[PDB]
Structures are given as structure tokens and as C-alpha cells.
Ligand binder design. Structure first.
Ligand SMILES: *[C@@H]1O[C@H](CO)[C@@H](O[C@@H]2O[C@H](CO)[C@@H](O[C@@H]3O[C@H](CO)[C@@H](O)[C@H](O)[C@@H]3O)[C@H](O)[C@H]2NC(C)=O)[C@H](O)[C@H]1NC(C)=O
Ligand SMILES: *[C@@H]1O[C@H](CO)[C@@H](O[C@@H]2O[C@H](CO)[C@@H](O)[C@H](O)[C@H]2NC(C)=O)[C@H](O)[C@H]1NC(C)=O
Ligand SMILES: *[C@@H]1O[C@H](CO)[C@@H](O[C@@H]2O[C@H](CO)[C@@H](O)[C@H](O)[C@H]2NC(C)=O)[C@H](O)[C@H]1NC(C)=O
Ligand SMILES: *[C@@H]1O[C@H](CO)[C@@H](O[C@@H]2O[C@H](CO)[C@@H](O)[C@H](O)[C@H]2NC(C)=O)[C@H](O)[C@H]1NC(C)=O
Ligand SMILES: *C/C=C(C)/C=C\C=C(C)\C=C\C1=C(C)CCCC1(C)C
Ligand SMILES: *C/C=C(C)/C=C\C=C(C)\C=C\C1=C(C)CCCC1(C)C
Ligand SMILES: [Hg+2]
Ligand SMILES: [Hg+2]
Ligand SMILES: [Hg+2]
Ligand SMILES: [Hg+2]
Ligand SMILES: [Hg+2]
Ligand SMILES: [Hg+2]
Ligand SMILES: [Zn+2]
Ligand SMILES: [Zn+2]
Ligand SMILES: [Zn+2]
Ligand SMILES: [Zn+2]
Lengths: 305, 338
């Protein structure tokens, strides 16, 4: 076998050498060297020490600033809060997992690792949706503390309809690559949870569609200021595709070819790269939005414009 | 002329267009697009956001935990401060400079930016020598009965500061000088102009000899000695392999150092030789700026390879509890000598 399956895992390595051990009981240092694991744990340490200040600052500013209540400001606060969950709920476990070369925290840790990452990306994928329409309405012209809170609520509803099932009984979060990150069970059919039907679902209801919607809405496209809130949204959407296509693409190749001879590094890259999703959004924000950039500076200098 | 030489600078651009302008009076947008200056400003902003906490937590942890006092634990508190000094002393001035397209605060803004980047780079280099030594005295069977105390640790720290100031202070006093580099938002040692009357051709030879080759010779010869025992393998104050974990670490900090300062040192030596030659702004911006990650990686390695210190910041961050010999002044921090 080009792989080693367990009742709850799947290590991309042949146990013909009788060296493959569970990602839950012993380090996976027989997959890659101990330097690449501490390298991952360093990356995770950085993502943590940036994802926190940057998302929380963002959170503290829109909350602190009285005149910061645009749907954009709402969606961007959302991401800042989802990015914080990613960081504490998820990044916490993935940091300590790498520091041990396996899931020391057990499955509760694998679930923590995957739920917040999927919730993370899905809230982004869904908030990018709540934004695309707003731009078909304030630019293609067919809001506020009213409707933005429904889009913001809706993003959690939808994201949760994706990150929540593998926790209860539809699909399962399972260690990927160097067995340090967890994601949807693309690897096995597992008749018991038919993650074969969940992947066909997640890929359509939480990937394909949400995207085509962000597309035709875009294809079907103060009065001069909306061009920069647009160019931002456009950019936000593009940066998301860069985090998730490398992943989602790799994730699908595997779902269809369940059994191939791929290695651990194969999915470790698109998967660990994708975690910048927790930090990248609030950077585009300062960059192309004179309103926030200035208001953030005011939160820092305590008044000196 | 391939470059406009001023009494204070050297813009790597040609003024046969009159488009060049003093990096102390106007933005250097003519040297390259505005968005590139925006990326430097973003980049510096992200470094200041990381270098601060990472370095400050590293700092706050060592002080609070009363038994975290080995030469290593010491020499690494030194780096958190030097890095914080970079973050505030230099980095604050490098981000304002990028945001505005030139050195608005002028020559002192160039001095603070260049001084604290050199000071921090050298606080680093020399600390690697006090540590490369520390390693020897412990691993390759040295002395006869000796063991390091806190006292020895402070002398190495005091030494690194004198050796870093010995390199960074002169350009503020008249020996060589801090001049803007690349896109003109970073400041370093003058390798560009002869300026025979501040002794430029002189200092650069001194700095590269005394503040680069030598410490590297020593650090490399010590590492050559620590092959008698600790070859290359190492697979926290617990047993025999507690030192092998420190040595393997101290041996990584040297590799990181290289990757960080070689590019800069390399492209900087090129210039000193090929002065007046045709190079662009971008040329030096990259090594220079990448090198600025120097204010951030040391504690990253520390809290990654030191099982004792890590659990210690995890103890600090978790208010005292935590769900390896206990040294954090949190968890039976009582003495255990003899
Ligand atoms: C991969 O194939 C090897 C065959 O070489 C399997 O080896 C077996 O590994 C399990 C744990 O993965 C061992 O069980 C445990 O043994 C220890 C003592 O060594 C005991 O304390 C535990 O309670 C448990 O019984 C088993 O001894 C070992 N047997 C062999 C062949 O050495 C291995 O299970 C396979 N890995 C997987 C799970 O895919
Ligand atoms: C082990 O991995 C190899 C390589 O991915 C698999 O071989 C391929 O199998 C597909 C059919 O699913 C063929 O179309 C390819 O031509 C094969 N490639 C080769 C081997 O040249 C193989 O099926 C895998 N073994 C298992 C466990 O199914
Ligand atoms: C490049 O050549 C131009 C050609 O004049 C210089 O421009 C003059 O600079 C002085 C001093 O800053 C100004 O007072 C003049 O107004 C400029 N001349 C004009 C109006 O064209 C420029 O200084 C040279 N580049 C540098 C700064 O070295
Ligand atoms: C202007 O720049 C040119 C090119 O960068 C300098 O000319 C160099 O002269 C050497 C002499 O050995 C030639 O071999 C090179 O081809 C030239 N450039 C290089 C190093 O590639 C010239 O000296 C500069 N002019 C001044 C004096 O500033
Ligand atoms: C680092 C941990 C990771 C990447 C775990 C899980 C990720 C997912 C379940 C992602 C799902 C998707 C998202 C977030 C956006 C594009 C579509 C998708 C299904 C690949
Ligand atoms: C971002 C600003 C910078 C990097 C300014 C100045 C840097 C130096 C003077 C560096 C000197 C050196 C160090 C720190 C270590 C290797 C040798 C060296 C001379 C290149
Ligand atoms: Hg749109
Ligand atoms: Hg990205
Ligand atoms: Hg404001
Ligand atoms: Hg050494
Ligand atoms: Hg570096
Ligand atoms: Hg500790
Ligand atoms: Zn099962
Ligand atoms: Zn299938
Ligand atoms: Zn010369
Ligand atoms: Zn640990």
C-alpha cells in the first residue's frame, strides 16, 4: 500500500518498513526530518504573533471608531474575529503539534485544528459573498447596522454548515501531509461516515457555487469613492483564491485519486500556506482604504492625525 | 556619472535628467514606483508588529522567571533588548521614511535608522562569539573543573555591547558615516564614495576585518573544535543531551545569521570595491531590508528549540499554571545547588 490507513488516520507512507506509527501516538519524524517540523512550528509561531495583533487591532479600531460602520467595515470586523478564532482555536494546536511531530493533543486537537481553519476560510469565502452582492447593489445599483449584521450572521451560518458536520458525523477531520494539520477526509471513502458524499457537497455548496456567485456578480459590472472599496473587494477575492486554490486543488486531486502514491510534503504546502488566510485580509485593509488606514493611525497616536 | 553624489549621499541614479533629488529633501519616487515604497512601509510595519511582542515577551519572560539565568538565557535577553532598540530606535524611522519616500527627519533620521540596525546586527554577531566560546568551555572538554556563573554572562553581554558600539558608534563621530541606500529608505555605512576626509576607505576595511571575518573565524574555528564530540547530530536541564540541544541551537543561530547578513554583507562589499559603478536602487534595498528580519528571528528560534524557555512563556502567558528541570520563577523556583 502506497499509504497506511488507521481507523481514524491516513499516513502518506508505506508501512512496508514497519515504521509507520499513528499521528496520534508517536511523532511522524519518519516522514520528514526534525528540522522541517520545527520550521513549521516557527511559521506557526509567526502566524500567531502577527495574526493576533493585526486582527485584534482591526477589531479594536472598528469597535472604537464611531464612524466606521460600512458593510465592508462589518465584514472586515467579522474576518478579524474569525481570524482570531483561527489563531487561538486552531493555530494554538497546530503550533504544539509540529513541536511534537504529531497530534499530542489527540483528536480533540485535530478537530480544533480543522474546525477553526475551515470555519476560517469558509467565513472568508462567505464574507466575500456578502461583499460581492453589496457591490452589485451600490455600484450596479438595482444596509448598515441592519443588513450587514445579517450577512455577518449568514457567513457564520453558511461557514458553520461546512466546518461543523465533520465534528458530529458527516466526514471527519483527519491529519494531512506531515500529519500536522487536519482537514476534510479526502483520503478515504469510510463507508461509515461517507465523506465521499460530503466532499461532493462541500466542493459544490461551499466552494464552486459561492465562487460563481462572486463571479457573475462581478461579470455583471462619494460616487467616485466606491471604486476603491470595489478595488479592495476585488483584491480580497483574488488573495483568497491564492490561499485556497493551491489547497482546494490538491485536496480534490486526492479525493478523486484516493490511493495514489503522493508524499507528505505534497499537501503540507498548499495547506500550511493557506493559513495566511488568518493574516492576509487585515493587510489589504490598511493598504487600500484611506478611511481605516487613517482611523487606525488615530487609534495609535491617540488623536494626532 | 552613473550616480548623483551629494555631500551627504549617493543616489544610485543618473542626474543627466536633473530628476535626482537629495534623499533628505524629497521622495525618491523617480527611483522606482510609489507602490514599491508602499510595500517597504507595509513590510516595516509588519516587522515592527512582530519584533516588538516577540522580543518584548521574550524579555518579560526572562526577568519574571528568577532561575532562567544561564549564559544562554542571558545572552538571549540581550538580543530581545537590542531587537526592541531596533524596533524603536531604527525601525520607527525606517517606516516613516518609506511612508514619505525619503528621510524626512534628515541625517539624524538616517543615523538612527542606520545606527540601530548596525548595533543590533553587531550585538548579534558578538553574542555568537560569547556563545561560541560558552559552547567550547562546556562541550569540547575544556578548563579542568570550571562552570559559568551569572557574572561571566554579564561580561559577555557587556563585551558584546562594547564590540557592537565599537563598530556602530564611529560613523556618528566622524569615522565613515551613515548614508541612505537602495531606494533611499535604509541607511548604512558609506561604501559608495571615497570621501577621503571622514576616512571612508579606512573604516570599511576595519569593520569587515574586526567586525565580520574575525568573529566568524573564531565562531567557525570553535565549531570546528566542537566536532570532537557534537558532530552535527542532536536527535532542557534534564540530562546528558540537555547541552546537545543548546549546542545544536547555538549552531543554528549562526546559520540564520549568515542567511540574514551574508546577502547584505556580500552586496555591500561589492559596492566598496566597484564604487561609481552602475547599480540600481533595488540592488541594495532587498538585502538591507531582508536583513531587518534580524530584529525578529532570534527569539523565534529560542521559543522553538529551548524546551525550558518555551514552557516558560507558556507559563507566563497562562498566568502561572500550565496544563525539564523547573526554572520559571513559576513552579518550585527554589534553589537546588550544593
Ligand atoms: C506499521 O507496521 C508495523 C509492523 O512492523 C506495526 O508494528 C506494530 O506497531 C504497533 C503500534 O503501531 C505496536 O503495538 C504496541 O507495541 C508496544 C510495544 O512495542 C506496546 O507497548 C503497545 O501497547 C502496543 O501493543 C506493535 O508492537 C508493532 N508490532 C511490530 C510488527 O513491531 C505498526 O502497528 C504499523 N503501524 C500502523 C498502526 O499503521
Ligand atoms: C499506488 O500508487 C500508484 C501511483 O499513483 C498507483 O498506480 C497508478 O494507478 C492508476 C489507476 O488508479 C493508473 O492509471 C496509473 O497508471 C498507475 N500509475 C503507475 C503505478 O504507473 C497504484 O494504483 C497505487 N496502488 C494502490 C494502493 O492502489
Ligand atoms: C540634478 O540636476 C538638476 C539640474 O538643475 C539640479 O536641480 C537644481 O537643484 C537646485 C538645488 O537643489 C535647485 O535649487 C534648483 O532649482 C534646481 N534647478 C532647476 C530649477 O532645474 C539637481 O539639484 C541635481 N540633482 C541633485 C540634487 O544632485
Ligand atoms: C559608470 O558605470 C560604468 C558601468 O557600470 C563604469 O564602467 C565600468 O568600467 C569597467 C572597467 O574595467 C568595465 O569593465 C565595466 O564594463 C564597466 N561597468 C561594469 C563594472 O560592469 C564606469 O566606471 C562608471 N563611471 C563612473 C566613473 O562613475
Ligand atoms: C491548515 C488547515 C486546513 C487547511 C484545514 C482545512 C481546510 C478546509 C476544510 C477548507 C475548505 C475550503 C475553503 C476554506 C475555501 C475553498 C474551498 C475549500 C473547500 C477547499
Ligand atoms: C536596514 C538597515 C541596515 C541593515 C543598516 C546597516 C547595516 C550594517 C552596517 C551591517 C553591518 C554588518 C553586520 C551587522 C554583520 C555582518 C557584517 C556587516 C558589516 C555587513
Ligand atoms: Hg461584484
Ligand atoms: Hg493568501
Ligand atoms: Hg476616523
Ligand atoms: Hg562552538
Ligand atoms: Hg534572517
Ligand atoms: Hg520553565
Ligand atoms: Zn473507522
Ligand atoms: Zn472516491
Ligand atoms: Zn574608494
Ligand atoms: Zn513542549
Amino acid at each position: 500500500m502506497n499509504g497506511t490507513e488507521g481507523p481514524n488516520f491516513y499516513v502518506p507512507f508505506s508501512n512496508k518498513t514497519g515504521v509507520v506509527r499513528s499521528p496520534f501516538e508517536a511523532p511522524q519524524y519518519y516522514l520528514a526530518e526534525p528540522w522541517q517540523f520545527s520550521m513549521l512550528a516557527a511559521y506557526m509561531f509567526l502566524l500567531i504573533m502577527l495574526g493576533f495583533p493585526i486582527n485584534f487591532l482591526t477589531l479594536y479600531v472598528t469597535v472604537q471608531h464611531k464612524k466606521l460602520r460600512t458593510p465592508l467595515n462589518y465584514i472586515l470586523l467579522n474576518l478579524a474575529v474569525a481570524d482570531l478564532f483561527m489563531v487561538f482555536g486552531g493555530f494554538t494546536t497546530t503550533l504544539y503539534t509540529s513541536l511534537h511531530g504529531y497530534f499530542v493533543f489527540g483528536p480533540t486537537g485535530c478537530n480544533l485544528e480543522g474546525f477553526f481553519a475551515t470555519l476560517g476560510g469558509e467565513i472568508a469565502l462567505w464574507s466575500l459573498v456578502v461583499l460581492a452582492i453589496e457591490r452589485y447593489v451600490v455600484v450596479c445599483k438595482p444596509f448598515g447596522e441592519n443588513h450587514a449584521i445579517m450577512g455577518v450572521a449568514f457567513t457564520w451560518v453558511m461557514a458553520l454548515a461546512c466546518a461543523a458536520p465533520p465534528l458530529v458525523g458527516w466526514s471527519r477531520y483527519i491529519p494531512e501531509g506531515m500529519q500536522c494539520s487536519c482537514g476534510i477526509d479526502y483520503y478515504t471513502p469510510h463507508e461509515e461516515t461517507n465523506n465521499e458524499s460530503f466532499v461532493i457537497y462541500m466542493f459544490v455548496v461551499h466552494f464552486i457555487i459561492p465562487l460563481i456567485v462572486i463571479f457573475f456578480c462581478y461579470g455583471q459590472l462619494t460616487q467616485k469613492a466606491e471604486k476603491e472599496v470595489t478595488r479592495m473587494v476585488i483584491i480580497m477575492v483574488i488573495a483568497f483564491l491564492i490561499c485556497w486554490l493551491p489547497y482546494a486543488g490538491v485536496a480534490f486531486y486526492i479525493f478523486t485519486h484516493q490511493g495514489s502514491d503522493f508524499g507528505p510534503i505534497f499537501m503540507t504546502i498548499p495547506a500550511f500556506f493557506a493559513k495566511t488566510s488568518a493574516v492576509y485580509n487585515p493587510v489589504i485593509y490598511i493598504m487600500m482604504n484611506k478611511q481605516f488606514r487613517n482611523c487606525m493611525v488615530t487609534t495609535l497616536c491617540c488623536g494626532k492625525n
